Each structure stands twice: as C-alpha cells, then as structure tokens.
From a paper:
Protein arginine methyltransferases (PRMTs, E.C. 2.1.1.125) catalyse the transfer of methyl groups from S-adenosylmethionine (SAM) to arginine residues of target proteins, giving a pattern of nitrogen methylations dictated by enzyme type. Co-activator associated arginine methyltransferase (CARM1, or PRMT4) targets substrates that contain proline-rich sequences rather, than the GGRGG sequences favoured by PRMT1. Co-activation of gene transcription is effected by methylation of histone arginines: H4R3 by PRMT1; or H3R17 and H3R26 by CARM1, for example. Novel non-peptidic bisubstrate inhibitors and crystal structures of their complexes with CARM1 are reported here.
The catalytic core of CARM1 was crystallised in the presence of amine-guanidine inhibitors 4, 5, 6 and 7, and the structures solved by molecular replacement. Electron density corresponding to each of these respective inhibitors was clearly observed in the active site. In comparison with the position of H3 Arg-17 (the arginine targeted for CARM1 methylation), the guanidinium groups of all inhibitors reach beyond Glu-257 (which forms a bidentate interaction with the substrate arginine η nitrogens) and Glu-266 (that forms a hydrogen bond to the ε nitrogen of substrate arginines). In contrast with previous results, a weak interaction of the 5C amino acid-guanidine 7 with both PRMT1 and CARM1 was detected, exhibiting IC50 and Kd values of 20–40 µM. Binding of 7 to CARM1 is also evidenced by the clear electron density in a co-crystal structure. A terminal amino acid group (as in 7 and 10), or appropriate isosteric replacement may therefore be beneficial for ensuring that the arginine mimicking group exclusively occupies the substrate binding channel in a single binding mode, as achieved by SAM for catalysis.
Numbering used by the authors:
A (entry chain C), B (entry chain A): 135 to 476
The structure:
Amino acid sequence: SVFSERTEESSAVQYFQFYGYLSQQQNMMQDYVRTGTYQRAILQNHTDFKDKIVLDVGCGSGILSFFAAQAGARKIYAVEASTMAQHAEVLVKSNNLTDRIVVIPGKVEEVSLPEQVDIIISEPMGYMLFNERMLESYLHAKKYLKPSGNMFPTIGDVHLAPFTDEQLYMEQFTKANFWYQPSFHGVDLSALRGAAVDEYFRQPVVDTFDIRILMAKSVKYTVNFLEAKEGDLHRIEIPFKFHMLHSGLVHGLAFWFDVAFIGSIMTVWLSTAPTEPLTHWYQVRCLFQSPLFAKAGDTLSGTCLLIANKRQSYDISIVAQVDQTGSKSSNLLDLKNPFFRY
Amino acid sequence: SVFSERTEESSAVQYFQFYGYLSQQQNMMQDYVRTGTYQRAILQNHTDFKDKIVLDVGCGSGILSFFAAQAGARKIYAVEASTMAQHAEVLVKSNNLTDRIVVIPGKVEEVSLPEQVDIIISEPMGYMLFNERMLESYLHAKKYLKPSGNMFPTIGDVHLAPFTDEQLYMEQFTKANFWYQPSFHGVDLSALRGAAVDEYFRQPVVDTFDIRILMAKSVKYTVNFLEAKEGDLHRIEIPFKFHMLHSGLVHGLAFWFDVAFIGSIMTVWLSTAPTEPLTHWYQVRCLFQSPLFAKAGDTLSGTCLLIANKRQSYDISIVAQVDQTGSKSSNLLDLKNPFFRY
Ligand SMILES: N=C(N)NCCCCCN(CC[C@H](N)C(=O)O)C[C@H]1O[C@@H](n2cnc3c(N)ncnc32)[C@H](O)[C@@H]1O
Ligand SMILES: N=C(N)NCCCCCN(CC[C@H](N)C(=O)O)C[C@H]1O[C@@H](n2cnc3c(N)ncnc32)[C@H](O)[C@@H]1O
C-alpha cells in the first residue's frame, strides 16, 4: 500500500503499538485545550455534520466521531489501525451509537469504505506539525471525499521565529563536552567530541518558553489540506526572511503551529503558539551549532527543508544567514529523536 | 543465527538503534558505581588479564576493553552489533591501541573469532537483571572460552522481596478512574475502566524507594555464568518463601540484582540494591492485583516465573499466598513495557 511503501516495518510496529495503550489516549484526552477546541470546532459548525457522512482518520478512542455524532452526523466511518479500534467499538456500543459510528479496523491506505464522505475529520498533527507523517494519511483519505467535501482541520500554519536562549545553548554544549575528556578513567574520549556535538544538536528541543526570547516576528508557512496532495509532504521547503527586531545572538529557530477548522458557521482555531495556553504539542526549537550575531534592523534569511524519511519523521535541514554580514549557520536535525526538556 | 531465531526483527532494530546513540553511552558511563566498579574489578584482578586474550561482548564505546588493556591484556576482541562499533574503532585508533583491541562489528552469535579466549567481559545486565536478554549472548559467547577460562561478571544474584506501598497501589486506580466518567465532553467512558486498570497493572514499575517499604528479607536467585547454558534463561523459575518481618498489606514484589567479578586476586561486587547508591538500573516493582495481609512471623510463598519472549524481554508471572491464611494473589506483567516512575 501507500503506507507500507513509505514506512519501515519496525517503525510502523512501534508506532501502532504506542497508540494501542489506553494511558496514551488518556494523556491526549486530558489536554483540555485540544479536546475542547475540537469539540467547539465540530459542535459550533453543526451544519457541516448534520445528516452528513463523515470519515474519521485515525480515530483512536473515537472521541471526534462522538463529537460528529453529537453534531448530528448520519454516518461516521471511524478508521483506526492500532488495537485501540477494539476499545473504540466498546465505547460506540456502550454509548448506544452503533447506528451512527462504524469502526473500520486498518490503515486508511488499505481499507475499503462503502461510500464517499461529505467531511473528513482527524488529528494528524505531530510536533512541528509534520512529525509522525500522519498528514499524508489524512490527505490520502481525500480519495473518499466527495467533490466540495470539507476537511477538519482545513489548514495548518507553521510559524517559525529566531530566538536567543544562551542557557539552552550551553546545556546542550555542556552535555556534548563530556566527550572532550582526554582521560575519562584513563581513556581519551576526545576524538568523538565532534560526533557527540552533532548528535546533541540534531535533537529538536520540545518545551515551552517566554515569548521574550523571540527576536523577530514569525514567518508563516501554510498548508491547505483541501488542496495539498500526499506527495507534497515528502519534501517541504520553507524559505524565510526575518526582519530582526532585537540585537543579540540568535541560537536557533522556534517552531509552533496553528490549525483552522473553516466551517460554514465559523472558523475555529487550535493554536500551539507560545502566546496561547500550553498544549501537549508544546513548541519546538532547533538550535544552531554556532549562534549568529544580528543587530536590530538586520535581515536573517534562509531555508528550512524537511525531507520525509521512512521512520515516520523528517530530516530537517536549516540554513540561515545574516544578510548584512554573510554570517551563516547550517544545521541538520532528526525530528524522530527530540529532547523533551519540559 | 541463534540471535535472529529468538528475536523479532522489529525489536532488534529498535534495540540496536537505541544503543547507537552517544548520549546513551554517556548516561551509562556517568553512572560512577557502574563504571568505577568495572574498572576496579578488572584492574585489581590484573593477573586475570596480563598477557591474556579477552572477548568483550557488546563493547559499546569500548570502555571495558580499554580497562582490559590497562590491565595488560595481549589481545582483546571487542564485539558490537550497533553502529556504536564505528565510534569504538575511532577510540581504539585515537588511544593508540590498534595492536591490542580488535573491534568486530556484528552480533556475537554471528561473527567469527580467530581464536579462543582466556576471559570474557561484558555488561549484559538489564532491568531486573534479565531484561533485554543480553545474558544469553554472554553465555552464547562461551563457545569461544578456553576450558577453565573466566567470566567477568562471574555470577548474578537476583533479589526479590515483598513490599508495602499503599500510594503506589492506589495510583493505578486513580489513573484508571479517568475512564470512570459518564460524560467526558458528552461521552460515557466508563466501559473502558477495567481495561485501563488491567493495562496499568501489567507494567512493572521502574524507580527507587525507601527500604522501609520492604516487609521481609530478600530471596536470592543465583545464576552462575561459568556453568549456565543459554537455554537456562528461556524459563526462569524463582520459588520464594518469605519470612515476614513486618505486619501489613503486601502490594507486590520488588526486584534488584548484584553481580560478582570473582577474580584470582579478589571478588568485586556491583550491587543495585536499594540499600546502595542509586544506579541507572534503579529497582523494579511488580504489583499484585490484590494486596495480601500478612503478620510478622507469617510466610509468603509462591513463584515468580519469567518466560522469555521474542521482544528481547520476559513475560513475568507472579503467584503468591500467605501460608497461614490461604490468601492468594497473582499478576502477569510485561517487562518490555515498564512504567518509568522515577
Ligand atoms: N505529538 C503528540 N504527543 N501527540 C500527537 C497527537 C496525534 C494523535 C492522532 N491520532 C489520534 C487522534 C484521534 N482523534 C483521537 O482522539 O485519539 C492517532 C491515531 O491515528 C492512528 N493512525 C495514524 N495513522 C493511521 C493510518 N494511516 N490509518 C489508520 N489509523 C492511523 C494511530 O493508530 C493513532 O490511534
Ligand atoms: N539499563 C539499560 N537500559 N541497560 C543496561 C546496560 C546494558 C549494557 C550496555 N552495552 C554494554 C556496555 C559496554 N560494556 C560499554 O562499556 O559501553 C550493551 C551493548 O551490547 C550490545 N549488544 C547487545 N547484544 C549484542 C549482541 N548479540 N552482539 C553484539 N553486541 C550486543 C549493545 O548493542 C550494546 O552496545
């Protein structure tokens, strides 16, 4: 299938095993910003669901399908590849919604549905939006979408901004500097110091931070899920040009994302911005190996390039330069090995 | 090979990927009890190494091979299956030991060595001693050991003891009671509460604890690595009869381990007991489904059975009874999915 071809089997096994646990579902459900915002998006846009046919891609415990049912959906096909499908079916029966929610076990790339749908709902966002490559499954599922069907979420905005955080930078350097020792119990480790530095700086940092570390306004990169094709997410090129509002050392780029549910009644936003209440996505920072000095009024330009890999993640290439001086930093990150600093 | 036959490929891939990271090597190296005790065992037993041929099973960064070299080994074959083998080779060259340490990339069950060895060194201990099933690779490697060759570590003692920890026990139901809610955003979750409870009780708890929770002296189960065969570790039956030193509710069994390096000059011990400084192995606790009341002077008897599985771990079956009352409890736990409580 399209899934098996893009995904190493060992990655897939671990991925679906992880989502089989009720404790993982509980952690996500307890994010009230997440769960309450999805419910609001769906219920306040009840006319997008009333008497409609719905596909829930990767339904987990089924929560979004229950919201679609609360909003009056006629039929909801709830697709789920992990063993969580079993638990979803238990809830459908115990909530007396067997006439409206049909659990379909399997990958959305592999199952057969009996009809086309009016609207697709999912929660395909990982860290930095793109981690886990579930957006591809979501876009793949548009093979079931009627012409002029809707997608909830409809669009995703990735925000990037330069930050300064000397303490974060030094933390990672301090860890890597372990490998500088010429006599660790009599052993010279120093030949590996470069490799150690590279490894640590390849880890995106997942946590939150004070917005005062940001040195310019964010650049926004928008993916429209009604228009995007699955293949568009194999290679994602994000150019940026920041007008620096503060002078200082730029230690990296910070990332967050917003999704919008563009319904017939209203647009509801779920934001993971550092100006908004914290969610379980936090925010993500990619450190530069060497910071770049810029003055207020300078321009920091470059590219963030995300290349999808077979471990359901992305290799991230970030190249940035201060236009006025030619000072450049170039860095490679492995979005599958984040450092959870919170 | 013997490895591939006992190990699912997806488990192996994840396992060796994990050990490929320098940050994981650093975490282990920074455990001073671990690293200092290995160095002491080797250096203080220098006659077991001087001008000897050594095999280092699963050498990682190579640190134990460097200690063997410090002690005067003539030739050290250092086997390692992860990409850490590359980093080990870099250290062998930068420490000017290419005449003495030969890094052999691959599984010890699959590579060829050119000669028999005088002594095998390894660090094959996981959580509860047996997790990761690396002891089997260690025992497998005795095909290369000369008659009367030594093994460092030489023996391993697993300790089990009954504990009382009312708060730990109650925490399982508190977490599972998330599901015991008739209207979570309008959805009745209650039918999943039993499945949630079962899931949490299947997870052994990795953390440390105050020794005052222990209700009896530990029972010790000893594996002699000079005598044990690989096959002895497929099913590990640990009968126990605890003479209760305190009266109270027994919520489960706590586990830790010691290994001894029985050298010609001295025996050096590495302990992970809760009476000793904390190591990166912590300790492990397995809950009973129901607590058992016992009085000081009673006997708590039963069996801990560890059955090796193809995810490089064990299914743990614990059955226990208070002999004087006939009160019985059981649990089945999955050592591959521990709860890291810290
Ligand atoms: N970054 C952190 N921490 N969290 C990110 C949160 C994202 C979780 C999204 N979703 C749960 C959303 C659902 N609405 C609910 O309420 O659980 C995950 C579920 O989708 C399933 N799945 C993934 N791919 C496919 C596919 N190709 N075919 C069929 N099923 C698929 C997973 O098996 C998992 O069950
Ligand atoms: N508590 C947790 N999680 N672990 C406890 C610590 C475990 C020890 C870590 N290390 C040894 C340390 C080394 N002496 C050092 O000094 O670095 C294990 C290494 O054995 C290797 N390996 C495993 N199997 C095989 C096999 N069949 N063939 C070849 N190599 C094998 C691992 O690839 C890993 O590199």
